[PDB]
Design a protein around this ligand. Structure first.
Ligand SMILES: Cc1sc2c(c1C)C(c1ccc(Cl)cc1)=N[C@@H](CC(=O)OC(C)(C)C)c1[nH]nc(C)[n+]1-2
Ligand SMILES: [Cl-]
Length: 127
């Protein structure tokens, strides 16, 4: 069994900038979700080898996790907030696609997603 390489967190060919929205996504959104009691399965890529999920990366072809997002924010990898918001949504959607309603991991994603929604509702206007 073998895991794929993780998503990239650096790339000089990718355009990027800092924005107050992206600052908010790190200081408020990522920080809030990262400290949550249910964050830990989402803090790094799914290790399909150690978890014995050999079909994981047959079903999930756009991997994402908060470890990757955290690095992308810390590295100022993004051009805009939408790119980062999309990564969070991919992470949640992957969980729901792979798993089943009522599963513990789905309850965990739901709890993180609730907070994510609450925070992005007050994404500041671009300055
Ligand atoms: C490190 C990680 S990453 C992860 C899990 C764990 C443990 C857990 C999980 C985490 C916490 C609790 Cl309470 C229950 C399950 N679930 C798997 C899928 C699965 O069913 O795995 C087992 C067969 C359970 C190994 C899954 N899907 N998406 C993610 C992000 N995860
Ligand atoms: Cl980069």
């Amino acid at each position: 069994s073998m895991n794929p390489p993780p998503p990239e967190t650096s790339n000089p060919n990718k355009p990027k900038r800092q924005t107050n929205q992206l600052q908010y996504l790190l200081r408020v959104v990522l920080k809030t979700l990262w400290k949550h009691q249910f964050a830990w399965p989402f803090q790094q890529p799914v290790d399909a080898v150690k978890l014995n999920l050999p079909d994981y990366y047959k079903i999930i072809k756009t991997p994402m996790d908060m470890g990757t997002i955290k690095k992308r924010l810390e590295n100022n990898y993004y051009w805009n907030a939408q790119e980062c918001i999309q990564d969070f949504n991919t992470m949640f959607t992957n969980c729901y696609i792979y798993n089943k309603p009522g599963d513990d991991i789905v309850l965990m994603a739901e709890a993180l997603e609730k907070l994510f929604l609450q925070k992005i509702n007050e994404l500041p206007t671009e300055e």
